[PDB]
């Protein structure tokens, strides 16, 4: 039956996307609406987490802004995201980087891999 689910959700799935990994720095040009004036906003951070199947796939990006740690979770296949773009991959040994929640100050740094 999950076959059936995939059959009916393949339309809302996307193909514009790169492959990204938990642990890699990444910008996203998400869309926003204020006064009927649509705009974009660039959320640039590191991927803590990616999970889910097909349309329910979800991923979390973490950042620091004005000394404050921020996390922002998105479902993958939104139309609301105009685009995503990697800036650097990362040599990481895990899938879910919940220790970076705690850490910062040049210990929360990811060794680039140049994939």
């Amino acid at each position: 039956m999950q076959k059936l689910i995939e059959d009916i959700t393949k339309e809302q799935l996307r193909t514009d996307l790169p492959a990204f990994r938990p642990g890699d720095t990444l910008r996203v040009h998400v869309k926003v609406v204020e006064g009927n004036r649509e705009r974009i906003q660039i959320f640039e951070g590191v991927v803590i987490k990616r999970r889910g199947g097909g349309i329910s796939e979800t991923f979390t990006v973490r950042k620091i802004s004005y000394g404050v740690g921020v996390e922002r979770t998105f479902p993958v296949h939104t139309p609301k995201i105009a685009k995503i773009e990697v800036v650097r991959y990362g040599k990481v040994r895990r899938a879910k980087l919940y220790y970076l929640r705690e850490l910062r100050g040049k210990a929360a740094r990811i060794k680039e891999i140049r994939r």
Binding site: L4, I5, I8, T9, Q12, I55, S56, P75, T78, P79
Partner: protein
């Protein structure tokens, strides 16, 4: 008034001309068929039956076979009965499908809740527990049974028992999508019951 009945499959997410998610429930309603068309002259009320299956003959029985053989169809497993609808519209042997509905009609849906088993007062009736410390030997228990004067226990005092398996309705849901080629409904939200289970859908009783 309208109505249909099919089988639940599962849940997922769907967008709506936006980034706006929708938690969706998925139902397959292979084309249901009329079986009998009741009347106030003989049956005391106007109503119809609907069958939803295609059983094996090794599973069905003779009386079922006759009762359906009034129509030109096969024995059915999930047969139920709709009430208070237009009668002249329908006939016997008449199939009904999902293209009845559309992508914005509201609905009352009905099913059979999951079986949770012999559970206690808290999980069954939402009671509060006692403290887990400060010397208490009391928790997870239902409470007092009542006062002393009547020498008895009133009815309706709530207690453990087989939680689940109840016929439940959910009102004012909203249809999201239809796939008549796959005989599928996609409904905003969640319904009672487990997967593979019967679900009777109805035009909402506003």
């Amino acid at each position: 008034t309208k109505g249909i009945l099919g089988r639940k499959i599962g849940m997922t997410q769907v967008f709506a001309e936006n980034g706006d998610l929708i938690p969706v429930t998925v139902i397959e309603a292979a084309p249901n068929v009329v079986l009998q068309k009741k009347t106030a002259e003989n049956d005391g009320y106007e109503a119809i039956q609907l069958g939803f299956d295609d059983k094996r003959e090794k599973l069905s029985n003779k009386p079922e076979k006759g009762h359906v053989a009034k129509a030109e169809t096969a024995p059915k497993r999930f047969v139920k009965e709709l009430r208070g609808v237009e009668m002249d519209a329908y006939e016997v042997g008449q199939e009904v499908k999902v293209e009845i509905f559309s992508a914005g009609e509201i609905v009352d849906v009905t099913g059979v809740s999951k079986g949770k088993g012999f559970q206690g007062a808290i999980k069954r009736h939402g009671q509060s527990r006692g403290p887990m410390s400060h010397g208490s030997r009391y928790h997870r228990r239902p409470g007092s049974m009542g006062p002393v004067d009547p020498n008895r226990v009133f009815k309706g005092k709530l207690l453990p028992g087989r939680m689940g398996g109840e016929q439940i309705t959910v009102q004012n849901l909203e249809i999201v999508k239809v796939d008549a080629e796959r005989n599928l409904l996609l409904i905003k939200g969640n319904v009672p019951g487990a997967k593979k289970s019967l679900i009777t859908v109805k035009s909402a009783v506003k």
